[PDB]
Amino acid sequence: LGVGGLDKEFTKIFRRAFASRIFPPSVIEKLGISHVKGLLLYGPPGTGKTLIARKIGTMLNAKEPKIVNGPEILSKYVGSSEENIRNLFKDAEAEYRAKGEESSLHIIIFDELDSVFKQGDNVVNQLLAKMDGVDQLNNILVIGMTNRKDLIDSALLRPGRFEVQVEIHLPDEKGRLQIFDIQTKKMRENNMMSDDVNLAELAALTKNFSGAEIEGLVKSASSFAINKTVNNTKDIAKLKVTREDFLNALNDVTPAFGISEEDLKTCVEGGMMLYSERVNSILKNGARYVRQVRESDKSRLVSLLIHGPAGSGKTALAAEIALKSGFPFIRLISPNELSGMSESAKIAYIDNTFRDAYKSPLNILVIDSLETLVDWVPIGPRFSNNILQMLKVALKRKPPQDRRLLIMTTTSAYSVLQQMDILSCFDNEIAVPNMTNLDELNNVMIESNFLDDAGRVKVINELSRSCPNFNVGIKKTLTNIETARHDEDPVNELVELMTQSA
Amino acid sequence: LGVGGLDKEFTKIFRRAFASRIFPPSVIEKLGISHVKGLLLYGPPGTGKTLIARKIGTMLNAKEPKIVNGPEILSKYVGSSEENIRNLFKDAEAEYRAKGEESSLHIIIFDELDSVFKQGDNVVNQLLAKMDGVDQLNNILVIGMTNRKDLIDSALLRPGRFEVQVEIHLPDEKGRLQIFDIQTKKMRENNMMSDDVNLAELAALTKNFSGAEIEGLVKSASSFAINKTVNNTKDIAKLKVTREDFLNALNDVTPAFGISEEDLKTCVEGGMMLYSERVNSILKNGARYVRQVRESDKSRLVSLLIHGPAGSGKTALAAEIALKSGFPFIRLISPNELSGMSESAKIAYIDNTFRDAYKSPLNILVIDSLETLVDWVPIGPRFSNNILQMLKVALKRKPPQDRRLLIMTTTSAYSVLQQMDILSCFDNEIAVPNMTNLDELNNVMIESNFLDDAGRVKVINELSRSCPNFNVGIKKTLTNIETARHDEDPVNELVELMTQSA
Numbered sequence A, B: 001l002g003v004g005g006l007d008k009e010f011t012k013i014f015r016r017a018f019a020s021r022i023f024p025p026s027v028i029e030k031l032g033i034s035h036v037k038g039l040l041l042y043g044p045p046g047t048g049k050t051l052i053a054r055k056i057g058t059m060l061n062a063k064e065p066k067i068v069n070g071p072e073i074l075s076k077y078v079g080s081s082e083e084n085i086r087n088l089f090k091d092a093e094a095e096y097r098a099k100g101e102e103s104s105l106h107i108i109i110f111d112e113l114d115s116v117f118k119q120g121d122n123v124v125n126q127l128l129a130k131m132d133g134v135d136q137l138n139n140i141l142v143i144g145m146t147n148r149k150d151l152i153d154s155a156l157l158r159p160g161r162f163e164v165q166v167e168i169h170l171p172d173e174k175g176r177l178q179i180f181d182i183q184t185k186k187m188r189e190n191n192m193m194s195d196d197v198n199l200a201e202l203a204a205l206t207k208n209f210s211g212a213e214i215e216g217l218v219k220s221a222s223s224f225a226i227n228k229t230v231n232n233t234k235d236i237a238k239l240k241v242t243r244e245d246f247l248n249a250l251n252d253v254t255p256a257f258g259i260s261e262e263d264l265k266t267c268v269e270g271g272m273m274l275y276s277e278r279v280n281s282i283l284k285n286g287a288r289y290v291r292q293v294r295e296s297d298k299s300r301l302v303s304l305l306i307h308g309p310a311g312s313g314k315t316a317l318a319a320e321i322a323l324k325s326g327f328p329f330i331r332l333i334s335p336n337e338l339s340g341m342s343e344s345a346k347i348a349y350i351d352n353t354f355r356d357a358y359k360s361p362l363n364i365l366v367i368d369s370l371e372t373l374v375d376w377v378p379i380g381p382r383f384s385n386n387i388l389q390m391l392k393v394a395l396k397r398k399p400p401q402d403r404r405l406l407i408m409t410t411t412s413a414y415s416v417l418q419q420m421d422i423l424s425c426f427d428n429e430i431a432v433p434n435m436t437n438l439d440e441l442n443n444v445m446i447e448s449n450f451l452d453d454a455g456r457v458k459v460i461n462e463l464s465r466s467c468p469n470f471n472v473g474i475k476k477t478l479t480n481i482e483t484a485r486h487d488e489d490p491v492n493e494l495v496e497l498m499t500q501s502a
């Protein structure tokens, strides 16, 4: 018909909101019931709600549905906004007086309803008067659409007002396979598509797209082919799209609910070298925890804590573990996102990230430098309590309806966290120590291409008796080598720096 | 065509935004796609965005693009602002009814979009109504322009609304070389430009100029030549713009993203003498770091801490290191800039400086008297936490897209910084001591030309057993010597002053 991926939500709507309209009024009045005048649809944007609303009416051959926007009403002058509501229902009032109860069905669509409640009341009262009060009108059917159900006051959900509610979900694999066919029907119908394109492969490559994203993907793929000929020319009739066009167009559309690849990849990883036996164990534990949350239905929430001294390599390990998992959804919260905001904005952003995290089969969240997010300074001590409470409540909530996520958080102030008494929110703890032997330094120098062995041996020979038990991190060790490489006497300068660092 | 240095951006814009308009409607209807209606361009000011818009306008032979300014509408009265937006789309609406889908293209330009969000809702809602609502027009194409992308909320970036986004960068060598030719074509083609002028040299001398600065440079150069034939005619046949005029004009136009030469040179430096080996060591270390930052891909962020007793001479060393580097971009933040402002003003100033720092291939930043910027007083103790957190966050963020900068900060309260546990933000530390030996005093005496060798040795021979172990800084020594110079008996005054100094 034009819709795809919605089959158990199409029957439920039709059974209740439209089944009684088909039969003649005689039998309906014989039973002694009344028609429904409300319907609510909620879900993420770009999923196909207005499409359902417009497509359903075609079966009943009703009038073209009118459309109104909440912010449109809010932004106008007070008097005009007050007057518009009565103007909206004029034709329905006229038709009822004209033709009694045998009038045709009229549909009114109200979009972005929640905006009215976000702070207005005149609009709500006038709207409810036409459908519940003694001015009851028996021709209308109102459709409501919101992205947040929890903001709608319970007064509107009692019987007689918006009596039926439905939810729309992101499409699954079969939904995407159907949507691709629906979108490319006309293109295929005119022999303008190559025969080497397989829609099954595309159904799997596009992993977490919504309905709207596929349209843009197809449009970009078509544009790729169109631009191939211009500069207006002959033989346009031989135009054809190809698999390579789709593959290249896949690089221009980045979906929401996707991977923030740029940050995790560049900002967080500038090398990775195995210099000790502890790193392998840490990575193996990370891989095991990743596997546990993909093949088990008794664990839908796992949280960790990676602590240690400063400049040890926590964030790089967390990012490395996250990158190799392969989950569709990955995000991180770090101080760089929250710089320059006010407290309320920070709370709103933190809440919104978690709220968006509850709409995918699998998810991963990273929380970097927890002690900085709270503005901790030991002189007072001074810190923000509201953010701490929000994080404490959030780190233990379970996602709804058989969904699962994995949280990894880093810190360097273990004692401070122990004082605040929020150490019971975590399921396990991992420690990252410093370097404490010359063999690890030798491995690091070898793997960084410092210089030939003849020069490498001398540094260790001198440091053996100059400083036996140095205790330095990896981040500073990788910085000393870089600056010593540029000196005129690298061998002595590296030892001089390392002695001070210890 | 008229624009130089933006080939790839031009190709990307043309492929997506305008390609679909060339083909006849039949094939486009055959494919089953729709034309795009949005395009966003962002970058630094004075780079050639509206020039690109105008130049693209002529190829399709569309109507002359309208231009509207954000502040103009925003500041105007409420009623007039609400009413005047409808005036903009009148012609496009009329043409649609007149000629169906065969109508010509109409381009509308919206300038300074972000200004609407900096606080307006009615304008945005009305604008979106014409391109996303049921009253959509198929002839329009809206161009947006902004300098800060972060301020635009995500709601406007989803498919259907502004859908394609592009960035504009400052020109490089070849860009300036092409722009010079484009600007001086008319002078060259009329035998009004001397043959001794070489454009390649000017392309390399101007190191961080944008498009408009070159226009200004050419205008100043032409004015220089024009002014030499007044106090009058008969020179209107042998009028040429020689090379000297351009070199003189180079000293008249100062670009943004340049060097604040006066502040670094005059106020901060008032002498530099080598009275010890440690000074040479410090200078050599500074040079080593400077040349490290320039020739590496692993290190794109280096921060140092220079500390010592009060009056040791810290700021002069940092200024001397900065001046000898030769980088295109240099700036400093000191209490003098933030005097007389409120807290929010200081935060905004720091944020703007750091944001500006991230738009050049190479950069340097100086921060002077860190403990003073926070308003530290030890009686309470009382200090500002917001500025401290902002600075702590800002000292770790890395520049985007393969760029690099070097930060140098000075302080005299090392213990206080240790108490605030912000010593992990720095990669290396350098300590500057005072003077504690007589040979250094003799060296400064020699360098400052205080007196002949006789009195110079006499003063040392007296202070050898008058006071062997004084402890004084350079700043106070060079103020005592100066006041001793202008007395009638320098030796007796200066020996007593220096003995008291200890």
Ligand SMILES: Nc1ncnc2c1ncn2[C@@H]1O[C@H](COP(=O)(O)OP(=O)(O)OP(=O)(O)O)[C@@H](O)[C@H]1O
Residues within 6 Å of the ligand: A268, A269, A270, A271, A272, A273, A274, A275, A279, A309, A310, A311, A312, A313, A314, A315, A316, A317, A412, A474, A475, A478, B424
């Ligand atoms: N095996 C390794 N483990 C960890 N880090 C490594 C390893 N090999 C190389 N590195 C480098 O170590 C550097 C450590 O930087 P990183 O951002 O992880 O520090 P950090 O511990 O988060 O610092 P801070 O505590 O100051 O926030 C990374 O840039 C990475 O390139």
Ligand SMILES: Nc1ncnc2c1ncn2[C@@H]1O[C@H](COP(=O)(O)OP(=O)(O)OP(=O)(O)O)[C@@H](O)[C@H]1O
Residues within 6 Å of the ligand: B268, B269, B270, B271, B272, B273, B274, B275, B279, B309, B310, B311, B312, B313, B314, B315, B316, B317, B412, B474, B475, B478
């Ligand atoms: N080799 C030198 N090193 C440092 N300062 C020198 C040297 N030769 C001369 N000077 C003079 O030392 C003076 C003191 O330096 P400066 O003005 O930077 O003081 P400061 O350490 O920043 O002061 P304060 O601690 O009060 O902030 C400078 O005016 C400079 O002219």
Ligand SMILES: Nc1ncnc2c1ncn2[C@@H]1O[C@H](COP(=O)(O)OP(=O)(O)O)[C@@H](O)[C@H]1O
Residues within 6 Å of the ligand: A002, A003, A004, A005, A006, A044, A045, A046, A047, A048, A049, A050, A051, A179, A182, A211, A212, A215
């Ligand atoms: N489930 C779906 N099946 C087919 N097409 C869809 C679906 N969802 C969205 N689309 C396409 O996306 C376009 C935009 O949908 P839209 O009206 O924005 O839905 P909503 O606004 O309710 O999210 C429509 O023209 C439609 O063709």
Ligand SMILES: Nc1ncnc2c1ncn2[C@@H]1O[C@H](COP(=O)(O)OP(=O)(O)O)[C@@H](O)[C@H]1O
Residues within 6 Å of the ligand: B002, B003, B004, B005, B006, B045, B046, B047, B048, B049, B050, B051, B179, B182, B211, B212, B215
């Ligand atoms: N890439 C370029 N090539 C040639 N001239 C340029 C370029 N960019 C800017 N200019 C010149 O700078 C002048 C001002 O540019 P302007 O239209 O103000 O750009 P913007 O509106 O983006 O600041 C123009 O008259 C133009 O001649």
Ligand SMILES: [Mg+2]
Residues within 6 Å of the ligand: A314, A315, A368, A369, A410
């Ligand atoms: Mg970290």
Ligand SMILES: [Mg+2]
Residues within 6 Å of the ligand: B314, B315, B368, B369, B410
């Ligand atoms: Mg100073």
